[PDB]
Design an enzyme around this catalytic site. Sequence first.
Site, PDB file in Angstrom:
ATOM      1  CD  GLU A  35      -1.667  96.709 -15.697  1.00  0.00           C
ATOM      2  OE1 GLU A  35      -1.141  97.407 -14.819  1.00  0.00           O
ATOM      3  OE2 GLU A  35      -2.407  96.948 -16.662  1.00  0.00           O
ATOM      4  CG  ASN A  46      -4.743 103.858  -9.832  1.00  0.00           C
ATOM      5  OD1 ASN A  46      -5.390 103.288  -9.461  1.00  0.00           O
ATOM      6  ND2 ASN A  46      -3.789 103.440 -10.679  1.00  0.00           N
ATOM      7  CG  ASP A  48      -8.568 107.273  -9.145  1.00  0.00           C
ATOM      8  OD1 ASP A  48      -7.669 106.771  -8.601  1.00  0.00           O
ATOM      9  OD2 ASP A  48      -9.712 106.805  -9.405  1.00  0.00           O
ATOM     10  CB  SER A  50      -8.347 104.167  -6.684  1.00  0.00           C
ATOM     11  OG  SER A  50      -7.716 104.282  -7.885  1.00  0.00           O
ATOM     12  CG  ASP A  52      -4.070 100.053 -10.287  1.00  0.00           C
ATOM     13  OD1 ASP A  52      -5.081 100.240 -10.016  1.00  0.00           O
ATOM     14  OD2 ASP A  52      -3.470 100.569 -11.496  1.00  0.00           O
ATOM     15  CG  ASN A  59      -8.324 101.226  -9.712  1.00  0.00           C
ATOM     16  OD1 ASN A  59      -8.280 101.696  -8.683  1.00  0.00           O
ATOM     17  ND2 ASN A  59      -8.369 102.079 -10.813  1.00  0.00           N
TER      18      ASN A  59
END
Length: 129
Positions: A35, A46, A48, A50, A52, A59
């Site tokens: 990650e 991301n 969409d 959003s 991380d 998220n």
Amino acid sequence: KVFGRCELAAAMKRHGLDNYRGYSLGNWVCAAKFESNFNTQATNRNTDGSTDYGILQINSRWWCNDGRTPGSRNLCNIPCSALLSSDITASVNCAKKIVSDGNGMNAWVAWRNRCKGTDVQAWIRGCRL
Ligand code: NA
């Protein structure tokens, strides 16, 4: 902060992630490697819209508030910036909620694709825990 592998393994274990919801320490260290490369300051946008945040790439869609993720929740009741700290307490507290949400560590696509079913104990090899 860029954690060392055994340094992060110790920190996660002190914060009670070892065998949390039945996931062994190596699963968590493996997730953090793929990650964030063990970097508390890691951020990634991301598709969409959003973002991380931090060592476990939590998220903004569900878990933390960053003020720029429309129609998003803050289920860990924390600013996403708190997930970038050298102290991993916030990230661990939030990750416990994520992994309890019903799909276990499948919530971390990098865990499912890169750690799940692998020899995750290798990630704690040589560590004094
Ligand atoms: Na949010």
